[PDB]
């Protein structure tokens, strides 16, 4: 699992302003880190169905936030997806 | 249980005291339960009925 220091680093790297923890960029980056971390757990536990529901929820939340960012401003959306390495 | 006897206790009184010890222990109840296999649905229904009866009895006492 990720640590408080890791989350603080991600927020520092993706924060628009001071104390900015609610920005779509910060939220999407945090979700991406969490998902890529959980991939390892789900490699070793294929039949842990109950956690995969939460993983799918994280995926859906990221999708909705990315769509909102795209609707509001395209340049920030492109920068975020490029920085985080996401196809769409 | 282990109902040890006094020096002069009558055997009949000893058996009476052993009956009280065993009745408090409730060993025979588990043996009665174990005779046959009860289905989970039936156990659920029985426990629900028991809880309802207990609540009604407590309300009657309060009234």
């Amino acid at each position: 699992a990720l640590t408080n220091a890791d989350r603080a680093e991600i927020i520092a790297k993706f924060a628009r302003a001071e104390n900015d923890t609610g920005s779509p960029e910060v939220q999407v980056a945090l979700l991406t880190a969490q998902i890529n971390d959980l991939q390892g757990h789900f490699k070793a536990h294929k039949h842990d169905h109950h956690s995969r529901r939460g993983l799918i929820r994280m995926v859906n939340q990221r999708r909705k936030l990315l769509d909102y960012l795209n609707g509001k401003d395209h340049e920030r959306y492109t920068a975020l997806i490029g920085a985080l390495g996401l196809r769409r | 249980p282990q109902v040890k006897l006094k020096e002069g206790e009558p055997v009949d009184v000893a058996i009476r005291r052993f009956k009280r010890s065993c009745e408090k222990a409730g060993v025979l109840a588990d043996v009665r339960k174990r005779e046959f296999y009860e289905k989970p649905t039936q156990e659920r229904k029985r426990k629900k009925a028991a809880a309802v009866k207990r609540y009604q009895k407590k309300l009657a006492r309060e009234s």
Binding site: - | P1, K4, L5, V11, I15, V27, V31, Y37, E38
Partner: protein, 117 residues
């Protein structure tokens, strides 16, 4: 032949039959009796009186070993557990202690099906 001062009486009571056995400590047996063994063959085996006669005969047989004080162990439901100890006391023995040793599983094997009678 052998003389032992201390003994133990096991009463294996059931809903169908009562078995009364007399053993020494360390479990070696001395005498035994049963309701079916002493007449009463049929449903009357479970009746407490047959337990009393079985206990009387078992005690009379065991008296040859010269034991006057005996411990009591009882296992199982059904009538006959009380009559056996009463008869053992009446016969002339001294009952030092009485305990229940009926085995209780901690949710192990599945019991047989219920009878639809």
């Amino acid at each position: 032949t052998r003389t032992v001062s201390e003994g133990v009486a096991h009463i294996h009571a059931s809903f169908n039959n009562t078995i009364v056995t007399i053993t020494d400590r360390q479990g070696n047996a001395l005498a035994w009796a049963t309701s079916g063994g002493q007449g009463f063959r049929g449903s009357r085996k479970s009746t407490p009186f047959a337990a009393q006669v079985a206990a009387e005969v078992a005690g009379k047989a065991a008296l040859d070993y010269g034991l006057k004080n005996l411990d009591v162990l009882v296992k199982g439901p059904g009538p006959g557990r009380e009559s056996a100890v009463r008869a053992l006391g009446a016969v002339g023995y001294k009952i030092n202690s009485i305990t229940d040793v009926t085995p209780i599983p901690h949710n192990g094997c599945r019991p047989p099906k219920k009878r639809r009678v």
